[PDB]
């Protein structure tokens, strides 16, 4: 449901025990996202979709 918040600028997901962050493939819609924070999680591979 975060994919619909087109006006987001900061996303903080501290200590959410995120394992896979492949949902980055859907964050290109947000034209104002500048401060994606994913610290304090358990993520292995940064997805190729950062581009």
């Amino acid at each position, epitope marked *: 449901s975060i994919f619909s918040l087109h006006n987001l600028q900061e996303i903080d997901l501290k200590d959410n*025990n995120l*394992k896979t962050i492949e949902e980055i493939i859907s964050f290109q819609h947000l034209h104002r996202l500048t401060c994606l924070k994913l610290w304090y999680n*358990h993520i*292995a591979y940064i997805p190729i979709q950062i581009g």
Partner: nanobody
Amino acid sequence: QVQLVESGGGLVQAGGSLRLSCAASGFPVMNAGMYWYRQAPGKEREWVAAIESEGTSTYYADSVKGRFTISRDNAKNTVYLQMNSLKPEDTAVYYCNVKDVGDNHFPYDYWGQGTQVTVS
């Protein structure tokens, strides 16, 4: 509250397959290291199987490596253990163990009641 309990205890002659189980209360199983220990008459608690949190990697002792199978089922909030034609000398009382869950109070090691499985 935090408590550990397992089931599946039953005496089975050599030649069958027994499916153990467990039950964890008060914490998720994914964010915790679950352990299986064996207890035998006249013998102390010997480690058997361990499953690592945040990555789900299985760790086995050379005593029973390559025969057991451990899996974590977060749907039931439990840990399932399966044997593959365990030897008669493998009879023991199996203990579950989870240590240092996200909650940090005086009991740091939680053990199950204990189930006795017999092989003959």
